[PDB]
Amino acid sequence: MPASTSAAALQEALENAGRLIDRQLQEDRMYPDLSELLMVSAPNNPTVSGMSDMDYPLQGPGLLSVPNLPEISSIRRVPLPPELVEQFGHMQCNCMMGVFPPISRAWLTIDSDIFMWNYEDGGDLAYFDGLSETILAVGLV
Amino acid sequence: KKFVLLSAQGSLMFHKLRPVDQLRHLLVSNVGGDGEEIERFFKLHQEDQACATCLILACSTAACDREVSAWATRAFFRYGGEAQMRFPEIVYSGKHNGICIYFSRIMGNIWDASLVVERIFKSGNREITAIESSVPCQLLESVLQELKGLQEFLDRNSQFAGGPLGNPNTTAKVQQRLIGFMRPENGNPQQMQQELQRKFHEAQLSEKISLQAIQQLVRKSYQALALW
Amino acid sequence: IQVYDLGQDGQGMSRVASVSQNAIVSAAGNIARTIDRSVFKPIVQIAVIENSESLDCQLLAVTHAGVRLYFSTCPFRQPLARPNTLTLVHVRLPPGFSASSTVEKPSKVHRALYSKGILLMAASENEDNDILWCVNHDTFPFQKPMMET
Amino acid sequence: MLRESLKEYQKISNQVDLSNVCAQYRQVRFYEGVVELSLTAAEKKDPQGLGLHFYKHGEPEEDIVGLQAFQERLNSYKCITDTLQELVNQSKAAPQSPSVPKKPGPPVLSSDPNMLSNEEAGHHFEQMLKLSQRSKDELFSIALYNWLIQVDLADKLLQVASPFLEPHLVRMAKVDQNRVRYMDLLWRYYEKNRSFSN
> CA Rg, chain C, in Å?
16
Report the residue of B4, B5, B7, B9 to disrupt the D interface, i.e. the one with the largest count of D CBs within 10 Å: B9
Burial degree of B177 (CB within 10 A; 0-12, 13-18, 19+): exposed
Using the 8-state DSSP alphabet, how is residue A98 labeled? E
Neighbours of chain C (3+ CB pairs under 8 A): A, B, D
Contact (CB, 8 A) for C1 and C60: no
Measured from the Cβ of residue C77, the count of other Cβ atoms closer than 10 Å reads 11
Measured from the Cβ of residue C68, the count of other Cβ atoms closer than 10 Å reads 21
d(CA B192, CA D110): 86
Contact (CB, 8 A) for A76 and B14: yes
Distances (CA, A) of B181 to B64, B175, B177, B193: 49, 12, 8, 14
**3-state SS assignment for residue B17:** coil
Measured from the Cβ of residue A58, the count of other Cβ atoms closer than 10 Å reads 17
Distances (CA, A) of A110 to A84, B136, B198: 10, 46, 79
d(CA D8, CA C61): 42
Burial degree of A115 (CB within 10 A; 0-12, 13-18, 19+): buried
Bridge-partner residues for B10, per DSSP?
B7
Closest-approach residue (CA) in chain B for C111: B5
> Measured between CB atoms, which of B3, B7, B19 is closest to C120?
B3
Long-range contacts at D52-58 (CB < 8 A, ≥ 24 apart): D52/D138, D52/D139, D55/D139, D55/D142
Could you list the beta-strand ranges (E) of chain C: 2-5, 14-18, 43-48, 59-63, 68-72, 87-92, 111-115, 118-124, 130-135
- Summarize chain A as % helix, strand, coil (round to 5): 30, 20, 55
What are the backbone dihedrals phi and psi of residue D136, each rounded to the nearest 5 degrees, phi first? -95, -5
> B21: part of which helix (H) or strand (E)?
helix B19-29
- The amino acid at D194: R
Measured from the Cβ of residue B215, the count of other Cβ atoms closer than 10 Å reads 18
Which residues of chain B make contact with C138, given a CB cutoff of 8 A? 16, 18-19
Distances (CA, A) of A88 to A83, A110, B102, D107, D112: 10, 8, 53, 12, 11
Contact (CB, 8 A) for A68 and B1: no
Q: How far apart are the first and last CA of chain C?
A: 29
Could D100 and A82 be called an inter-chain contact, meaning their C-beta atoms sit closer than 8 Å? no
d(CA A30, CA A53): 27
Cβ-based interface (< 8 Å): residues of A facing D? 76-87, 89-90, 121-123, 125
- The amino acid at B154: L
Alpha carbon B84 to chain centroid, angstroms: 18
**3-state SS assignment for residue B128:** strand
Bridge-partner residues for C46, per DSSP?
C61
Helix pair angle (D31-43, D138-150), 10° resolution: 130
> Measured between CB atoms, which of A76, A81, A89 is closest to D102?
A76
- Please choose, from the candidates D162, D126, D168, D134, the residue with its C-alpha nearest in 3D space to the C-alpha of residue D149: D168
How far does the CA of residue A33 sit from the closest CA of chain C (Å)?
A: 5
d(CA D162, CA D168): 11
Contact (CB, 8 A) for B218 and B147: yes
How far does the CA of residue D37 sit from the closest CA of chain B (Å)?
A: 25
Which residues of chain D make contact with C127, given a CB cutoff of 8 A? 24, 27
Which residues of chain B make contact with C110, given a CB cutoff of 8 A? none
Neighbours of chain D (3+ CB pairs under 8 A): A, B, C
**3-state SS assignment for residue D12:** coil
- Please choose, from the candidates B33, B56, B58, B47, the residue with its C-alpha nearest in 3D space to the C-alpha of residue B94: B47
What are the backbone dihedrals phi and psi of residue D134, each rounded to the nearest 5 degrees, phi first? -110, -5
Could C138 and B44 be called an inter-chain contact, meaning their C-beta atoms sit closer than 8 Å? no
- The amino acid at A39: M
Angle, CA C96 vertex, CA C94 and CA C98 arms, to 5°: 100
Alpha carbon C23 to chain centroid, angstroms: 15
Number of residues that this document lists for chain C: 149
| Cis preceding linkage at C94, omega within 30 | no
Contact (CB, 8 A) for B211 and B96: yes
- Please choose, from the candidates B190, B202, D18, C54, the residue with its C-alpha nearest in 3D space to the C-alpha of residue D26: D18
Cβ–Cβ contact B14 with A under 8 A: yes
Q: How far apart are the first and last CA of chain B?
A: 31
- State the DSSP string of C113-149: EEETTEEEEEEESSSS-EEEEEE--TTSTT-SS----
Q: Given phi > 0 = left and psi -120 to 50 = alpha, else beta, which region is C48?
A: beta
A-D interface: how many C-beta pairs under 8 angstroms? 55
- Please choose, from the candidates B143, A33, B107, the residue with its C-alpha nearest in 3D space to the C-alpha of residue C51: A33
Residue A111 CB partners (closer than 8 Å, separation 6+): A91, A92, A93, A94, A134, A135
**3-state SS assignment for residue A105:** strand
Bridge-partner residues for A97, per DSSP?
A108
Residue A73 CB partners (closer than 8 Å, separation 6+): B14, B15, B17, B21
Could A14 and B220 be called an inter-chain contact, meaning their C-beta atoms sit closer than 8 Å? yes
How far does the CA of residue C128 sit from the closest CA of chain D (Å)?
A: 6
Using the 8-state DSSP alphabet, how is residue B165 labeled? -
d(CA A99, CA A108): 9
d(CA B139, CA B106): 10
Contact (CB, 8 A) for B167 and B74: no
Measured from the Cβ of residue C50, the count of other Cβ atoms closer than 10 Å reads 10
Angle, CA C102 vertex, CA A57 and CA B17 arms, to 5°: 40
What are the backbone dihedrals phi and psi of residue D61, each rounded to the nearest 5 degrees, phi first? -65, -25
A-B interface: how many C-beta pairs under 8 angstroms? 111
How far does the CA of residue C48 sit from the closest CA of chain A (Å)?
A: 13
Closest-approach residue (CA) in chain A for C50: A34
Burial state string for A59-85 with b = 16 or more CB within 10 A and e = fewer than 16: eeeeebbbeebebbeeeebbbbbbbbb
How far does the CA of residue C114 sit from the closest CA of chain D (Å)?
A: 26
Could D24 and C126 be called an inter-chain contact, meaning their C-beta atoms sit closer than 8 Å? yes
Distances (CA, A) of B61 to B66, B74, B96, B149: 7, 17, 22, 7
Could C122 and B1 be called an inter-chain contact, meaning their C-beta atoms sit closer than 8 Å? no
Cβ-based interface (< 8 Å): residues of A facing B? 10, 13-14, 16-18, 20-25, 28, 64-80, 97-99, 101, 106, 119-120, 122
Report the residue of C114, C132, C135 to disrupt the B interface, i.e. the one with the largest count of B CBs within 10 Å: C132
- State the DSSP string of A60-75: -TTSS--TT--SB---
d(CA C30, CA B161): 58
Report the residue of C26, C76, C136 to disrupt the A interface, i.e. the one with the largest count of A CBs within 10 Å: C76
- State the DSSP string of D34-52: HHHHHHHHHHTT-TT-HHH
Interstrand relation of A47-49 and C87-92 (parallel, antiparallel or unpaired): parallel
Residue C145 CB partners (closer than 8 Å, separation 6+): A37, A38, A39, A49, A55
Could A73 and B14 be called an inter-chain contact, meaning their C-beta atoms sit closer than 8 Å? yes
**3-state SS assignment for residue D151:** coil
Could you list the beta-strand ranges (E) of chain A: 47-49, 76-78, 95-100, 105-110, 113-117, 126-128
Residue D8 CB partners (closer than 8 Å, separation 6+): none
d(CA B41, CA C19): 45
Burial degree of A125 (CB within 10 A; 0-12, 13-18, 19+): middle
CA count, 13 A, side-chain hemisphere, B132: 9
> B117: part of which helix (H) or strand (E)?
strand B116-122
> CA Rg, chain A, in Å?
29
d(CA C149, CA C133): 11
Could A78 and D101 be called an inter-chain contact, meaning their C-beta atoms sit closer than 8 Å? yes
Task: Write down the experimental method used for this entry.
Answer: cryo-EM
Residue B39 CB partners (closer than 8 Å, separation 6+): B79
- Please choose, from the candidates A50, D185, A101, B79, the residue with its C-alpha nearest in 3D space to the C-alpha of residue C69: A50
Contact (CB, 8 A) for B118 and B134: no
Neighbours of chain B (3+ CB pairs under 8 A): A, C, D
Closest-approach residue (CA) in chain B for C141: B45
d(CA C133, CA D124): 34
**3-state SS assignment for residue B5:** strand
Measured from the Cβ of residue D87, the count of other Cβ atoms closer than 10 Å reads 21
Residue A42 CB partners (closer than 8 Å, separation 6+): C76
Residue D178 CB partners (closer than 8 Å, separation 6+): none
